[PDB]
């Protein structure tokens, strides 16, 4: 991920213009071989005609080239690239939001999964380790960083997400089918067991930690999908062959002729097709914007940082429910105790937001008449 | 299902241009059938207007030809299919989340229905058995490929997941209607059954399994709705027309024209359409994606994988509520148990990951004057 | 409701073509009339400029063609209509959603209001039947063809939704607003009594029927609201000006001249606009698609199903929650029982769908090496 | 609002045509005095090129009338138009559906809080009250027809909706943020009460009043938050500008020359541009929707007509929870008590959509072979 | 925010021509430095062409202009920007609805956190506390003025927000990640607390808590996933580089060339470009739509005033569950309790929308003949 939202909170005179210096995550960085292969190919053309070429064959090349420009139809490849550019960029957001976060099942249970002593404090991270531990078998299955990470389920063992117990249990089961659920079913096993031990005091809790559980199972099972049902493979063919298709007819087509020839609009040779160079960046940028995103747990620049989400979920979720367990300040009259009303401090940089009037509503200034305001 | 997730985790500089030697699922495995018969027209086509026209013929000809081209107007075709072929693509994607998975009744299954001697068994497994049964109806009701598994209910009952006393029952209901609905009702009675009997132990647990139950049977409903309800045919038929006017006018209007008569835009005689050839494979494939997608439950090679789903989880719900029932792992003390923090390993191939700074927010660097902080 | 999903299983070379020989739901029914003005006026138009106007009449004329033919833009109206279009079938498939379906319900009062004497059946079969005739008095409230069926509310009563001493209770209920919702305060009434009796055994039970009720009761709301609110009209005024501006550019502009009088562009006389006749096609069904599904609940071929709708929910609400009311077969061993693992069979037209590889995630081939799998 | 939906229930020949005929909520209403003026600044500038300007004054404005006509591109209006349109549409439909109903509520209220005494009918009266207090307090501030209806809270205290007791309390409260939610924190601590006092049974029950309370209040702030937070004024501006450029560019490019300079495309002088006036009634009628849309909870034709909405809900939600309390007919044997399956009757006009055969699911005409059945 | 909504809450002839004379959010304000510079980059080459180049320099200029105008496509940046603003717009509105609030939690803390004395306002008043210093952190983690205002922690904690205590258990965690999740495990442990005391009364109001509490944490969280994953960057290059590449060719091909060469098309030099000025404001504006919103909670003046929110939701929830606590007015008889129906009056500007027909549904004006209403 290459965050720049601090660089873009305001809308600036530079504004965009500063984006176009950065070099991570950038277009350039995606783009520049291909860019250099397409100023090869045209100017491997070019050369040619300028200097290989007999006269006759120059004249039936100019031909050709004047053939091809009446195919350099940008609008049908903007249409289809625009289409499925925000299906990508759509599916990658929600990509994004199936991550699966351990926030409120460590909330719930710090909550619900009661003891100070070491019983206690296994159930509640024997829990927060099962969801974690799910959630790195799926990730490990759809994400390559993560699947380098732990190549392995002996590397799973290791980094201490499974215990060798646990491990055997895991191997143990007779199915061929991805196992990312089974820390699932334990975690709703062992909530029933703390249920009947008392540990969890009522039933009402017990279904609040099923129900998260079963938030957070079904985003790994998103996880699953989407590595699954890639976006349909002829669509993106589709649109790949349309851009290639296009940037072969200008490849051709663009080629600067002779001037003398007196070809209409073939009169100025710059040597360098820089408007075309620009589109084929415009064009083949926008296309590669589908493909960085097509699969955000790959390595690209922008793709999700999924082992640091790993180990912050993990060590949030531990600290939640075992260092955080019952141990709240003394409960203490809060500053505004004895104001009616209250606002906390504005410092001189932000006070100027002050003396904005409190919108009301919309409505509270319409000023109408005497007579309009009786009642029938 | 033709996944390629893998191929395209990093936008790399062959990136999309290796999809295109993909056959399976591929716009060349769906469309040369097309292609051959476009050509074929358009050569036949070019050679009367060669070979067989008289002279006069061949003035008329060209005069068509000139006139037809003026109507082949690639905007409006583009922006009919941009619209509907992604009406049918988040279409089929809805399709697909429709799917009944049994992953939350089976965690919650096993969590609430309790007993491990052999009524508890029959209990898990069987409520289970009539989740899977409904998916296999409904499915069989709306996959052509599962059909052809289940081609009579009497295969369902030799496949054992209906049983011939459920047979006997299934069959003794009188309705003209679709009847996947039924084991959801059985699942519903024997649910209570159990609360009954004290299998299931507190209210709160039944409501959580009807709860869920209810979502499972109304992803049935919702694929018997998308497989009643079609993609307006008046649509359909209307983005057909539309492709095939334009391809119509393209057979005729690309004809290649004497160069010798000198007309305008015509002095290139390739023989060959070659752009034309890619628009239509360029269009005619993009309306290909909503062929495939339209019913995504048939087999082409894109269509979804029914059968291998419905296997996956009639075995995945067995094991999670049979064979995992209350099989836990003794409660042990975790690697990370004594460490304030946590933080798994990282291997060679991925600590480069690390010292990448923990983003913490994109206000963290703003670096305001001591005057500017204090409060008013 | 004119349903071809069977015949679009499959992305065949036939394919959509074969959709354009349908009649029932199609375009040629919906624009048969509209195609006929549109070249009775074309004709007329050119049977006068043939045959009726003086040379410099016909002059005027031609240069009035010529003038017009520069309106014909297509892409504005393209634009306008996807936006339109596009907005009415998605609106279209949102009221299919918010159909109000007793599944959930029936579901839930099988398994919560008890009892197999007469008054537990009474109770199941009036709360089902409430629903049901909320769900006719909205129906009939926005179906035409509801209507027809239920014209007044004795036939409501007659068709034995409602009953006559019910019938009484609803006429003297003083309200100058829609019914509709009557049923469903009745059957949160019927409920509390229910638990009041015992009938429903706990309190968890009687909280998730009242949800499911007002799941049902928002529903069908939502269709009130969607007969209520229409798109807005000043929108469809707009669509139908833009269409009806460009075939009036088209009625002018695309007459065929006098090749003699040697125009640019008008050199062949068809006597027969083919193309334009294809693109009002093209664009007037377009817009019918939105004529037809703008209002869903009329007696169009592909408007819902409104009275079969009525019919299964009844019929099967009934059946669910009284026929099938704790009426399960016993429970014994499934046919896999003693199976570890488990996997139905496979016909012959499908066994060739195994041999394809269980996915486990996409990450499962990339084969790293010795040296980079070591953790640091 | 201006309902039109019984008028387009089915497509008809007539279509969307009859609707060209409608005033209210029209295009014509909202865009004849725009339309005057565009006729009227382009019909000046032609009276001044017609008798005013000298022969040179007049070939410079033919040479400005051809420069200009360059610059009315309608491919850029009509693309920003569309987004734009389509944005303030939706967000249009999502405020509707912000709309605060009390059916919920009421159903819940009716089952759930109990006694035929006065003081029960105090508590769901109360209740139910608070909901429409708060719906009023906030539409007062977010509708100019509600705040015209109730421009003062003494106006609310004399409709009923709040008491004077009530009242002392609701302006004792210190806050400078509008007040919209206090009945529903009223509503809370009331429901508390009520539960305190068993007039609702359960905890079950309470749980459920509360999270239809907060459904509520939270539409109600949605509401709100829609008042607040406008369609960004940058974009409107966008969008205003683009369309008055193009409007600019036509009133020059399209005035009609002098066909005796022999101009290129300035042949025909009809002396009132009738496209040039279709287009901006087009464009301009396509930014009116937005106009009108933009804040649908004014008094436009086809703005929500929030007074009539309040009326309803109050009466509706009072009728419910008092009049219909415990008021059920006594349970009786239904029309289809001893009927094993149940169809109601069709009337002469319906009967017909009798006949069509129930769909059972897309898969059930394949008729495979025999040899294709067998299991493996 | 710039709330304009009170201007547009009709249709009217000014219209949104009125908003085309502000200036705070404006696009004025947000391009008049880009303006300037655009034209002082047109200016600078019109002077250098028209004073400094010599006859022969000044040709090959003529030409240089006549090649670049055929690369000012607006079609394709007008496509990629209305995909791309949409993008940018709809995340906007996403963002602000995940801004967190504290109305539920308040609502349901007043109804189920109880007693009068010191305690019960202590675990109220903490309860609404840690919820907003859980928004108070992450807001100062995201928005550039909430971090001005509260620039360290100390700052929160003399704002009141934050107590000594607490501040001292909030830096002993140890984690490297945003705490902004901290006071809601605070939360999570003091509704426990609150429960065990019998401060909350029931297992339901606790489980009730919890829920709305996960809800809250997560718009916090979601707060912090918009700030990290970035509209990607490569997506904002390509859409500000076609822009730029637009404006280019622009500044190139609209220079005014000597009438007296003669050129097409170049035969009236206005010295200003006006159109082409106005579509610099068009679509430059366009995408400072995107500038502004990409990141909402910067100081634009219509970026989100999050201090304001900030202000009002601690003020708001204090309110609530301290001062509102169990204070009700006593259960009086309201205004139509005697009333079988009810309806408040009208004033008389707002008497004029009764008479209007209260809608019933658009089925009850078909008016069937007898005949046609007979039951089978
Ligand atoms: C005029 C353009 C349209 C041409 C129409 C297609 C012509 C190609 C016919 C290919 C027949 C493949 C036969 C097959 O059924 O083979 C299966 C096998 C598995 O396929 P799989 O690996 O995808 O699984 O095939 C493989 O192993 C890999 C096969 C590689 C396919 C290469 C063909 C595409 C090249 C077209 C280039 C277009 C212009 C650049
Ligand atoms: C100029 C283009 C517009 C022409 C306007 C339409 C002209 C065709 C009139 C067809 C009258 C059908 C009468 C009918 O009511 O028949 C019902 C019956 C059931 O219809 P169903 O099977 O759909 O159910 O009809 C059937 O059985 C199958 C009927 C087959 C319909 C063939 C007509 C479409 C061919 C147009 C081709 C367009 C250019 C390629
Ligand atoms: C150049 C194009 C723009 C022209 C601008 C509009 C000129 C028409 C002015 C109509 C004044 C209507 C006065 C009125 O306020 O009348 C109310 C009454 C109820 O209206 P309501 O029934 O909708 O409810 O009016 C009715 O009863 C039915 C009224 C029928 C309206 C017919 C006018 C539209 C025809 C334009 C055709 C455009 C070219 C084909
Ligand atoms: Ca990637
Ligand atoms: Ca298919
Ligand atoms: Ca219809
Ligand atoms: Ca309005
Ligand atoms: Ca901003
Ligand atoms: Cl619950």
Request: aromatic fraction near 16%.
């Amino acid at each position: 991920t290459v965050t720049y939202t601090a660089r873009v909170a305001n809308a600036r005179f530079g504004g965009f213009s500063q984006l176009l210096l950065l070099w991570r995550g950038s277009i350039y960085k995606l783009l520049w071989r291909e860019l250099l292969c397409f100023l090869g190919f045209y100017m491997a053309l070019s050369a040619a005609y300028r200097f290989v070429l007999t006269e006759g064959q120059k004249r039936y090349f100019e031909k050709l080239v004047i053939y091809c420009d009446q195919y350099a139809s940008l609008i049908p490849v903007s249409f289809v690239l625009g289409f499925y550019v925000t299906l990508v960029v759509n599916r990658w957001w929600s990509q994004y939001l199936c991550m699966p976060l351990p926030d409120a099942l460590m909330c719930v249970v710090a909550g619900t999964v009661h003891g100070r002593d070491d019983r206690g404090r296994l159930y509640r991270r024997t829990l927060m380790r099962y969801a974690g531990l799910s959630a790195v078998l799926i990730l490990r299955s759809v994400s390559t960083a993560v699947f380098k990470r732990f190549p392995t389920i002996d590397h799973v063992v290791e980094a201490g997400f499974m215990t060798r117990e646990e491990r055997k249990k895991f191997e143990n089961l007779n199915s061929s089918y991805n196992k990312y659920w089974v820390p699932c079913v334990w975690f709703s096993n062992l909530a029933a067991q703390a249920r009947r031990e008392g540990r969890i005091r009522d039933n009402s809790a017990l279904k609040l930690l099923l129900e998260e559980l079963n938030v957070f199972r079904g985003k790994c099972g998103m996880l699953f999908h989407y590595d699954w049902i890639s976006v349909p493979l002829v669509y993106t063919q589709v649109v790949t062959i349309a851009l290639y298709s296009y940037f072969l007819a200008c490849l051709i087509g663009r080629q600067f002729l002779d001037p003398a020839q007196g070809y209409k609009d073939h009169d100025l040779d710059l040597c360098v097709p820089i408007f075309t160079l620009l589109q084929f960046f415009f064009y083949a940028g926008w296309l590669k914007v589908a493909e960085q995103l097509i699969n955000p747990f790959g390595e690209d620049d922008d793709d999700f940082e999924t082992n640091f989400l790993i180990d912050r979920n993990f060590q949030v979720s531990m600290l939640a429910v075992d260092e955080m367990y019952d141990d709240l300040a003394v409960l203490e009259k809060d500053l505004y105790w004895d104001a009616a009303e209250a606002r906390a401090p504005y410092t001189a940089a932000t006070v100027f937001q002050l003396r904005q009037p409190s919108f009301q509503g919309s409505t509270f200034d319409i000023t109408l008449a005497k007579e309009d305001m009786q009642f029938q």
